[PDB]
Design an enzyme around this catalytic site. Structure first.
Site, PDB file in Angstrom:
ATOM      1  CG  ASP A 213      64.267  27.357  74.040  1.00 19.75           C
ATOM      2  OD1 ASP A 213      64.915  26.858  73.099  1.00 19.75           O
ATOM      3  OD2 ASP A 213      64.032  26.746  75.107  1.00 19.75           O
TER       4      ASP A 213
ATOM      5  CB  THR B 297      69.523  25.279  66.865  1.00 18.33           C
ATOM      6  OG1 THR B 297      70.286  26.020  67.824  1.00 18.33           O
ATOM      7  CG2 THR B 297      68.058  25.504  67.139  1.00 18.33           C
ATOM      8  CB  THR B 298      73.207  23.987  70.402  1.00 18.56           C
ATOM      9  OG1 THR B 298      72.225  23.279  71.171  1.00 18.56           O
ATOM     10  CG2 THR B 298      72.945  25.469  70.535  1.00 18.56           C
TER      11      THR B 298
ATOM     12  CG  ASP C  26      68.341  29.350  70.610  1.00 24.97           C
ATOM     13  OD1 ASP C  26      67.671  28.613  71.361  1.00 24.97           O
ATOM     14  OD2 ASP C  26      68.274  29.305  69.364  1.00 24.97           O
TER      15      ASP C  26
END
Lengths: 185, 50, 521, 98, 525, 524, 74, 49
Positions: free
Chosen positions: E391, E90-91, E57
């Site tokens: 997540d 986010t990636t 993450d």
């Protein structure tokens, strides 16, 4: 130094109760006079603040001593270091009150300052400066302080001198002539 | 000297006299117990009053 | 050694030139930041964060200096911002160019003071002229207000969110008016709290008819949703408290210890039924709350929130109209929290919040800003500050001025006429001030990227015509545009304070002639 | 990381105007006081020793000024006048400086 | 320029600082692009303290890989906000930012003033948002749908097998959470880890688990049928707030005062004991007590003599969790105490591991709060799988919240590409350039998927760039054969909230960054 | 020169690792470093080790977990496998040795395939499937399902394996003593807790003279007399043995004279009464960890009472369990039912060390202690560590069942079976599974290297004799015959659960370390 | 903080000037510096000047060329 | 010692106690010295030899 010692617990609650009720009754004595504006150099506690709100009066804290003395001189109020009387009981008198037409806090430069307008007892004068930076403002207040000084001198001594160096203009020649009188070195 | 730590309160002066007397009576009582025991030699881990 | 031992001094024309250079640099580092075409500036703070904003004031506030006059200008910018919000997008630029033309008369050996007097006359005439070229406007008519706000904000990042921004500002400002001054009520911009919460989108941000509390229910049982809550503001702590007078207790009988332990419990209870006697629903305090009092209130089905900031308390009180109270025994139904259309506690994500909306006639309000990340949110809130500031300035003065440099050109030819009727040595400084004014539209042009010289000449020649004073410079087209149809309007007081502080800057700097260092005190 | 470009060398001293001129006048006066006592039928002479330790007494002011190696520029002119008068007419080089 | 104002300050200028920002963003996206995609490779970070991470993450990476470039910190902040909203992407967000800025530089370097591309981005975002809204697949709360969503989220993080195991746990949790209108993901979700026996064997426990154990030997280890007493009022000693040192005169009164001092706590415990004995007149039933504060050792003795289990100092949300688990009435004043205020559990026992102690609450009749007991062979893996769990939880929460769901594997992205490119310069013309660039940048997700999965980029992108017919489907990229895939059929999805939020955030961030010219540094020494 | 470029200045000074170069070379090298570090460790022919900590404390050791605990390591995946083995020890006992060897072998053989270009992910798949298949086939190898609960002989024979492993000289003594320990402890607080055994270290009187007591011991002084009663009555008190001081600041006060006399006298009298009441219930011995009042011990001497001192909380807990009498926080009530009962308690001298002994006989079950005797305290650390590992072994045995044939024989069968399954796998992962099967030869290899015989033909003969199903035949320990030995008759066994868990944890460590490709390292 | 970026490390320590900023401001300022330096120079009412070289030699002067020769400029 | 206090000894164990050994292996020998000293007496010397 007064230590409080309990041998009968039944009374701690009432003790704490009057610990505030003393201030409560002092405030109520002040307000029953009908005073709507109060000032105090000393601290002001929230206890008093809420009481004042419920009374709707005016309260100010941590005011400089000179300012409040001037307030007394203007409004005709009496500076009161405490509540007392020729007799021991702590009372307060309407005769101690000072007057002024209207009192307003106003926002100048998003900072609220408190105004007092037209004290009937003795006319007072205050001046507010407006300027760009603090540098120009405080240098001009120095200037104004000098202004008030010189005007005070003029009023105190009903006598004036022509400016722009006429002083030494005359003085040089007058002393020049007077010099030959001495005859010494 | 190093026994239980206590504050004391005394109105009458004579009672204060009695208090100091009673302390010394504590030590005298201990000493009398020691003597009337019939022994003659006493040793102590702890310090001895003069 | 005579004077101070390591205090420098410098004198005369060198000092004047140095100060002028400093002022010119100060202006220059910002000349790109003005205009609807504006740039976007970001800052490296000393202690790690990132700050990005068009607003000149913050830009300069994140500047430390060594030369003093630069510091003076910094303070000038901060003052103008404080007073009016924007114009600082222009004020320091105007001051710098003012000074730059001003210096040209120093090598004329023209002594500063006479030039200063010329400046004072110039300020008087400029104020008069601007007052002549104002437009009064209604304050109630909403869409004109929205137009004004859009005009004053279409220079910073919020431009693309103009509709939302204008609605937000109008709503917030309009509903903040403490009518207790008779017909002289004053609005205040410290009850219009701004809250930055990440996530969501700008479109999600909205005006909440109430307050935002970043706290949570103390105990599970209190209902998180209530239609018509009653609210009590306890300024005092709700728990047992130190005997302020260094009290002590000497118990002797066995029951006494447990009895005193019960006594504080009983005091807590006393406070509790004193509260519940008023049939409240909501308990708020800036101080802590005893879990035992928490128990009793739970037994009364009363929601309680603990340890909230004092300003937040004040805003809540102004929201639900109730007044803060510090003595439960002195609680009055007059301070019952009537006027809360809905009490609620939501989750923004990993955090509870408190919503108190739908007040009858809320006078306090906080704005809920929900965007991308804290720095962009900070930029947004700065822009909102500027917008709502100019809105309040309008609600103080209903007079408007055509911006886009148009007013500047009007002032220019007005002073030109006065000068050509005003023979004397001071004439040249007067028209110098006039010409110096012309640079705001100029900067607009460069930030647009058009032919500055030809455009400016066309503008000035256009504005020798008496029939029109509304001709200004469009932000994007880079073409002469009459301002009326374009609609970029500004509050009069803004531009007033602008010029006013500008010429003050001028006089203050031009009187300076020497430098002394190392006071060590 | 650009920097402003200087006009002259680092530490290039400059001092302009009335202060400069009055400083020069004061320096000339200082030079005078080193010789003021000298001339007179009851006048005076000085002793100056070099850094090498060789003593040297003198009453002729020009010799003394030669020994007083002046660094300040304006006074160098006065000392040069001393040399000139010494090569021309003699005592009163003292008087010349005064 | 400001150098004359301040010597020690630092600035760049327009071209220079713009290049600085684009370079920093490009480097950051290069670092991160290895992560996204189930075939991606997770990263191990080592703190200066010697600790260890093994995450994928990105938010962890950005927040924990210390960088100095300002825009890097800015992007880290926006990613942190993203993670606080949804959990992955986010990636995706940082990749979008970097590559969008890349195209932006490609165009501005051709002399285009950035503001034009800004406006193009605005219009493109509007059209893309419209298309995203219309394309979202409205699906109900079918269990298998949530299962697939969780699997798609999870396979980003761990072993395929580990995600498969964990998916059932997470979906069963979420199903056992909702009161049909509002989940809060906090109370009902208890996240605890024991350094025990597997990473696979981590599983949902239908009740609640506590992170401490009994403090006395006579404390019974196991209880068949349990009655729960939830409280926080001190059963430890305490002395009143007011100075109350007391005096006495006879040594017997010393003992008497000792008894008196204890007597108040004696009363407190005696009330509980009487409640028990009133209710647990039967021998079989068990009485357990949970205190948020401590328990006195003498109180321990008292409760033990009645064989009552008591635990002290649980975290302040644990009573919330017990309330939602065994329906007990969390109280404070034991004075107002009833059997009705009790909580009931089907089973409660203690599990001892290592030196720590753990407590189990089991078989709630209608549990509304549960615990994802994390079994981990290794401390770092605990943290990694915990981040993965969070997540997945947040993803499922968004899934249930929004009655729609977006097909995964970037089919949305090729759809945006084909739609946006299908905009004639209805824009003012020059903005069509920025729109083109934005659409190009959108295609990164399939690009990085293929690149991480080894397939050649351009040819895969072209191949998938085949809207088929009137039924031009939303086509995802195969993650193991590099072939066009119907995401909906294979059931690879993602939250609409994720895509909408990432689009908006990236648009705002990019339009702001492309509008900076110089990066100055003038602060106090 | 002197100035290459960086396209990423993102780091303020740190290590960026990438390009599979670290996974292909550096991480593998670190794992091999650990493998070489403790390759000599495991083995009956394995010889002991010593290490000093960062604080200069000696550690003679043969156990792998302990030695890894004393090397403060920095390469990350090194820590990975370290703490993996550490938790494994926390689970089963010996096997730390085993699992580290497994990790080294698996990593070393995996990097070879990675070099031959197999997909890292595919290596993962192959290793996982191989480990699962090995788990499946393992139970088919159990022999000698030793079932006897509380006999001494079977358990002694069994624990011989671990003791022999970590100490080759003294199998008989340690076996018999630890077996005596195991049989002496019944299920009382639940299924033979490891914590139920305590260990004391007493220097002097070399190892052969070490003994075991069915009670529990203390290296502390005594305050009055020294007596044992065949009916010893013990009282326990968590509270300090003194008049209960109020926690509140309670200052005794007086008002008149006689208060002083009466107060001191009454203090004396009521201490006397309290201790008398204690004596009245017949309790002759009292224990406490709290402070002891001199008055109290004086009266105890007057009443012939035994005192025990300065015990820590764990210590008094132990004693509580030993005598089964409940510790009493209240000083008063020497209640009959919760009052101590011990066969004998006295004070004795061993090694110039005052020793308090609770010599006992308990049918219901007691937590016994082992006494360690010999010269070197470091040898005490080693030997007690080995004994505790053996106790863990016995506990795991009790957990379920099913000894397995040690001496590598099991692992040779694993290799053969896994390989055979390998050629029926086909797919590019066939190489992965084949190498995994090959990896198990590390154990017999390690035994050879610590044995110092030519490993290769030993392994070959082992294979050959294992081609006939002789699953019980394994590696010998004999220079004269560097060939073979049949494990079952030799009794060289070990636990099913230990091998299973070691294998699974080694697999997990491997799959984790192989998986990571690029590394980031902030400056320490 | 404390770490902006450079997109060009081409220089081993040197001054890069660009953006017309130097032409618009700095170069002009230098020329004006010279102008002020010898503004007093020319003139029948112009008054003389003295300068000492780097080697401490006096130069009383009114001519501009000579005085410029004695200021070692950068 | 480093403190200046003299100490003579014939019992080897005392001496080895005084000779604060740093090398690890010899620490074992000195520990044997302590063991024999606590057990049986002289010949601690002999033990070490």
């Amino acid at each position: 130094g007064v230590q409080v010692v309990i041998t009968d617990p039944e009374k701690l609650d009432q003790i704490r109760q009057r610990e505030s009720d003393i201030t409560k009754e002092r405030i109520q004595k002040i307000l029953a006079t009908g005073a709507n504006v109060i000032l105090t150099t000393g601290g002001i506690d929230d206890m008093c603040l809420k009481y004042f709100v419920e009374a709707g009066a005016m309260a100010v804290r941590r005011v400089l001593k000179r300012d409040l003395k001037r307030i007394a001189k203007a409004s005709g109020a009496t500076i009161l270091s405490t509540l007392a009387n020729l007799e021991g009981e702590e009372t307060f008198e309407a005769a101690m009150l000072g007057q002024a037409e209207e009192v307003v806090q106003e926002r100048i430069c998003d900072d609220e300052l408190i105004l007092i307008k037209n004290t009937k007892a003795r006319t007072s004068a205050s001046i507010i400066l407006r300027g760009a930076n603090d540098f120009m403002c405080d240098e001009m207040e120095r200037s104004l302080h000098d202004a008030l000084c010189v005007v005070k001198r003029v009023l105190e001594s009903k006598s004036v001198v022509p400016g722009g160096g006429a002083v030494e203009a005359a003085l040089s020649i007058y002393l020049e002539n007077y010099a030959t009188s001495m005859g010494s070195r | 000297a190093e026994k239980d730590n206590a504050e004391i309160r005394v109105h009458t002066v004579e009672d204060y006299q009695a208090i100091v007397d009673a302390e010394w009576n504590i030590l005298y009582d201990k000493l009398e117990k020691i003597h009337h025991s019939g022994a003659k030699v006493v040793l102590s881990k702890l310090p001895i009053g003069d | 050694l005579v004077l101070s031992q390591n205090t420098k001094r410098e004198s005369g024309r060198k000092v004047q030139s140095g100060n002028i250079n400093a002022a010119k640099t100060i202006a220059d580092i910002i000349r790109t930041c003005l205009g609807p075409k504006s740039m976007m500036k970001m800052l490296l703070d000393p202690m790690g964060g990132i700050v990005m904003t068009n607003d000149g004031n913050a830009i300069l506030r994140e500047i430390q200096v060594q030369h003093p006059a630069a510091k003076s200008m910094i303070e000038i910018s901060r003052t103008q911002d404080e007073e009016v919000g924007d114009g600082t997008t222009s004020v320091i630029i105007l001051a710098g160019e003012m000074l730059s033309v001003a210096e040209h008369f120093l090598e004329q050996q023209m002594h500063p003071t006479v030039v200063i007097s010329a400046y004072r006359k110039a300020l008087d005439d400029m104020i008069s002229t601007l007052k002549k070229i104002s437009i009064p406007v209604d304050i109630s008519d909403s869409d004109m207000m929205l137009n004004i706000i859009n005009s004053s904000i279409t220079t910073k990042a919020i431009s693309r969110w103009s509709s939302l921004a204008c609605n937000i500002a109008l709503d917030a400002v309009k509903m903040v008016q403490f009518e207790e001054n008779g017909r002289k009520e004053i609005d205040i911009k410290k009850y219009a709290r701004v809250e930055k919460i990440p996530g969501g989108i700008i479109e999600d941000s909205c005006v909440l008819r109430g307050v935002m509390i970043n706290k949570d229910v103390t105990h599970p049982r209190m209902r998180r949703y209530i239609k018509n809550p009653r609210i009590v503001l306890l300024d005092s702590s709700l728990e047992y408290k130190k005997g302020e007078s260094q009290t002590d207790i000497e118990i002797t009988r066995e029951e006494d210890f447990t009895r005193i332990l019960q006594m504080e419990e009983e005091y807590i209870q006393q406070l509790c039924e004193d509260i519940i006697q008023l049939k409240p629903d909501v308990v708020i305090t800036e101080k802590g709350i005893s879990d035992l009092a928490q128990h009793y209130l739970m037994r009364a089905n009363i929601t309680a929130i603990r340890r909230v900031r004092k300003t937040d308390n004040n805003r809540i009180a102004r929201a639900c109209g109730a007044r803060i109270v510090s003595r439960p025994e002195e609680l009055r139904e007059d301070d019952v929290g009537t006027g809360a259309g809905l009490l609620e506690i939501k989750k923004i994500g990993d955090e509870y919040f408190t919503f108190i909306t739908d007040c009858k006639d809320p006078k306090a309000c906080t704005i809920l800003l929900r965007g991308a990340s804290k720095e962009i949110l900070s930029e947004v809130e700065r822009n909102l500050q500027d917008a709502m500031q100019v809105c309040r300035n309008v609600l103080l003065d209903p007079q408007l001025v055509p911006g886009g440099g148009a007013s500047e050109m009007a002032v220019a030819h007005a002073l030109t006429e006065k000068s050509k009727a005003m023979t004397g040595v001071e004439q040249w400084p007067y028209r110098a001030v006039a010409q110096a004014l012309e640079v705001i539209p100029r900067t607009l042009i460069q930030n647009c990227g058009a032919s500055t010289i030809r455009l400016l000449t066309s503008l000035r020649a256009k504005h020798t015509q008496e029939n029109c004073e509304t001709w200004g410079v469009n932000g994007e087209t880079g073409t002469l545009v009459d301002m009326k149809e374009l609609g970029i309007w500004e509050p009069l007081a803004v531009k007033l304070q602008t010029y006013k502080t500008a010429v003050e800057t001028a006089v203050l700097l031009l009187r300076i002639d020497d430098i002394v260092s190392g006071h060590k005190k | 990381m650009p920097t402003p470009v200087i006009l002259l060398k680092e530490g290039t001293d400059s001092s302009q105007g009335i202060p400069q001129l009055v400083s020069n006048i004061s320096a000339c006066q200082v030079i005078a006081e080193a010789v003021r006592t000298t001339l007179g039928p009851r006048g005076m002479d000085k002793l100056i020793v070099d850094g090498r330790g060789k003593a040297t007494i003198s009453n002729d002011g020009a010799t003394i000024l030669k020994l007083l190696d002046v660094v300040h520029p304006a006074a160098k002119t006065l000392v040069d006048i001393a040399k000139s008068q010494d090569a021309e007419v003699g005592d009163g080089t003292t008087s010349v400086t005064l | 320029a400001v150098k004359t104002l301040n010597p020690k300050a630092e600035v760049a200028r327009a071209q220079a600082a713009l290049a600085v920002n684009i370079s920093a963003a490009r480097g950051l996206q290069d670092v991160l692009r290895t992560n996204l995609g189930p075939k991606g490779t997770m990263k191990m970070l080592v703190s200066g303290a010697g600790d260890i991470k093994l995450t994928k993450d990105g938010n962890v990476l950005l927040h924990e890989m210390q960088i100095q470039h300002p825009t890097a910190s800015l992007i880290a902040k926006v990613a942190t906000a993203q993670d606080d909203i949804t959990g992955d992407g986010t990636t995706s967000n940082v990749l979008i930012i970097g590559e969008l800025l890349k195209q932006a530089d490609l165009y501005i370097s051709e002399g285009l003033h950035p503001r034009i591309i800004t406006e193009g981005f605005e219009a493109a975002k509007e059209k893309a948002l419209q298309f995203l809204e219309e394309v979202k697949v409205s699906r109900e709360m079918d269990r298998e749908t949530l299962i697939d969503v969780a699997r798609t989220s999870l396979r980003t993080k761990v072993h395929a097998e580990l995600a498969d195991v964990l998916t059932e746990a997470v979906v069963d949790s979420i199903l056992a959470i909702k009161k049909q209108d509002e989940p809060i993901d906090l109370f009902m979700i208890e996240i605890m880890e024991m350094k025990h026996k597997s990473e696979t064997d981590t599983s949902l426990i239908r009740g609640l688990v506590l992170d401490h154990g009994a403090r006395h030997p006579d404390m019974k280890k196991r209880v068949e049928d349990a009655y729960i007493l939830t409280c926080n009022v001190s059963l430890e000693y305490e002395k009143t707030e007011v100075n109350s040192g007391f005096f006495y005169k006879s040594a017997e009164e010393r003992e008497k005062l000792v008894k008196a001092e204890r007597k108040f706590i004696e009363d407190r415990v005696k009330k509980i004991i009487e409640l028990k004995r009133k209710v647990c007149g039967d021998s079989d039933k068990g009485f357990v007590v949970i205190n948020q504060k401590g328990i006195d050792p003498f109180s321990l003795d008292a409760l033990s003599k009645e064989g009552i289990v008591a635990l002290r100092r649980a975290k302040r949300r644990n009573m919330e969790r017990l309330t939602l688990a065994c329906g007990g009435v969390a109280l404070n004043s034991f004075d107002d105490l009833s059997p009705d205020c009790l909580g009931h559990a089907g089973l409660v026992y203690e599990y001892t591991l290592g030196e720590e102690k753990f407590t189990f609450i089991e078989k709630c009749n209608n549990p509304r709060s549960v615990t994802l007991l994390i079994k981990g062979p290794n401390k770092h893996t605990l943290t990694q799988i915990k981040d993965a769990v969070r997540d997945g939880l947040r993803a499922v929460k968004n899934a249930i919240d929004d009655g729609c769901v977006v097909p995964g594997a970037g089919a949305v992205e090729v759809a945006m590409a084909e739609a946006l490119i299908k905009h004639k310069p209805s824009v003012k013309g020059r903005a069509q350039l920025g729109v083109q660039a934005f659409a190009d940048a959108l295609l990164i997700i399939p690009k990085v998927l293929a690149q991480n999965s080894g397939f050649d980029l351009q040819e895969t992108l072209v191949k998938i760039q085949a809207e088929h017919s009137e039924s031009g489907q939303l086509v995802g990229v195969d993650l193991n054969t590099g072939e066009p895939m119907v995401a909906a059929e294979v059931g690879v999805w993602d939250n609409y909230c994720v895509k909408k939020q990432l689009l908006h955030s990236c648009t705002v961030i990019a339009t702001n960054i492309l509008l900076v010219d110089e990066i100055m540094r003038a602060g106090m020494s | 020169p002197k100035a290459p470029g960086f396209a990423q200045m993102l780091k303020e000074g740190a290590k960026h690792f990438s390009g599979l170069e670290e996974a292909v070379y550096r991480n593998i090298q670190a794992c091999k470093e650990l493998a070489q570090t403790t390759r000599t460790a495991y083995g009956p022919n394995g010889m002991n080790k010593m290490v000093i900590n960062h604080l200069e404390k000696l550690f003679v050791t043969n156990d792998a977990a302990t030695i890894l605990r004393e090397l403060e390591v920095q390469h990350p995946a090194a820590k990975m496998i370290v703490m993996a083995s550490h938790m494994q020890e926390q689970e089963v006992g010996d096997g730390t040795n085993f699992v580290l060897v497994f990790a080294g072998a698996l990593l070393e053989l995996a990097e070879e395939l990675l070099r031959i270009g197999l997909s890292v992910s595919e290596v993962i798949e192959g290793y996982e499937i191989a480990c699962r298949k090995a788990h499946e086939i393992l139970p088919n190898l159990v022999c000698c399902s030793a079932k006897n609960l509380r006999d001494i002989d079977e358990v002694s024979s069994l624990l011989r394996t671990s003791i022999m492993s970590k100490q080759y000289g003294n199998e008989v003594f340690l076996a018999k003593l630890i077996a005596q320990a195991c049989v002496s402890i019944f299920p009382d607080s639940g299924h033979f807790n490891v914590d139920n055994i305590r260990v004391c270290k007493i220097l002097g009187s070399g190892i052969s003279s070490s003994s075991v007591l069915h009670g529990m011991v203390f290296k502390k002084e005594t305050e009055g007399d020294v007596t044992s009663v065949k009916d010893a009555k013990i009282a326990v008190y968590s509270c300090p043995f003194d008049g209960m001081i109020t926690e509140t600041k309670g200052t005794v006060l007086i008002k008149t004279a006689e208060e002083l006399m009466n107060f001191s006298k009454g203090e004396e009298n009521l201490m006397d009464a309290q201790v008398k009441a204690i004596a009245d219930t017949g309790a002759n011995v009292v224990v406490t960890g709290g402070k002891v009042a001199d008055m109290a011990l004086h009266y105890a001497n007057k009443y012939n009472i035994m005192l025990v001192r300065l015990n820590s909380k764990w210590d008094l807990r132990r004693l509580c369990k030993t005598v089964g009498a409940t510790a009493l926080p209240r000083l008063t009530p020497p209640v009959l039912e919760e009052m101590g009962h011990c066969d004998s308690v006295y004070l004795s001298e061993v090694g110039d060390t005052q020793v308090v002994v609770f010599k006992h006989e308990k049918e219901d079950g007691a937590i016994s202690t082992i006494v360690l005797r010999g010269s070197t305290d470091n040898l005490m650390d080693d030997i007690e560590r080995a004994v505790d590992d053996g106790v863990n072994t016995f506990k795991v045995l009790t957990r379920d069942k099913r000894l397995v044939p040690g001496g590598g024989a099991t692992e040779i069968e694993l290799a053969k079976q896994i390989t055979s399954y390998g050629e029926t796998c086909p797919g590019l992962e066939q190489y992965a599974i084949k190498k995994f099967a090959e990896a198990f030869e590390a154990i017999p290899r390690a035994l050879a290297e610590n044995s110092g015989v030519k490993a290769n033909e030993v392994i070959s003969k082992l294979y050959a004799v294992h081609q006939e199903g002789n699953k019980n035949v394994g590696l010998d320990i004999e220079a004269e015959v560097p060939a073979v030995k049949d494990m079952l008759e030799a009794g060289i066994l070990d636990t099913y659960l230990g091998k299973y868990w070691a294998i699974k944890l080694a697999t997990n460590a491997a799959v984790t370390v192989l998986r990571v490709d690029q590394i980031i390292m902030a400056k320490p």
